[PDB]
Homo-oligomer: A and B are copies of this chain.
Amino acid sequence: VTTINLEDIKEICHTTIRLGGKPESGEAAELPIFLGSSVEFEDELYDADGTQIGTAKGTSVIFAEADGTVMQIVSAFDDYTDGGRVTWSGAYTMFPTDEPKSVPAQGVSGRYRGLSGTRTLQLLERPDPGTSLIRSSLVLNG
């Protein structure tokens, strides 16, 4: 029963933010629709030694669930240097913002294929609007 367990990953996250809002022209303007704030992000993954273990790409949008709690929905994947890809996606409470956040993950290729689990992220520093610093962990089981 194999367990992949990447801990204390250092994630440089390059963030392209759009606040969205009420659509003002196009097909969306004629509909009861609001454009959520979104972030397109492009990450580099490093182990403790400072070696690049992979990359990441995904997108996250803000919304609120049935009770009014502010949430975010993410869809993303990691391409790791040794071969495989791991997808991760789900919703998580937005606040507090320095809290560790987790969503289910699924290994799809390489040595991760057929394994599922959880990808975790936690904001450490936000030097500027285009860069976020995160410590991550990945736990996969099968």
Contact = CB atoms under 8 A, between A and B. Distances in A.
Contacts of A21: 22, 34
Interface string A99-126: 0000110101100011010000000000
Given A89-B75, A91-B59, A106-B106, A64 B18 contact: yes
Given A34-B36, A75-B91, A61 B63 contact: yes
Given A61-B61, A94-B28, A142-B113, A19 B37 contact: no
A34 B27 CA distance: 19
**Chain A residues touching B, range:** 35 or more
A61 B87 CA distance: 19
Given A21-B22, A87-B104, A108-B106, A38 B64 contact: yes
A73 B70 contact: no
Contacts of A32: 19, 37
Interface string A9-42: 0000000101111110111100011111110100
A56 interface: no
Given A27-B95, A75-B90, 17 more contacts: A18-B64, A19-B34, A20-B63, A20-B64, A25-B68, A27-B70, A28-B64, A34-B34, A36-B63, A37-B63, A38-B64, A40-B65, A61-B63, A73-B73, A87-B87, A108-B114, A108-B116
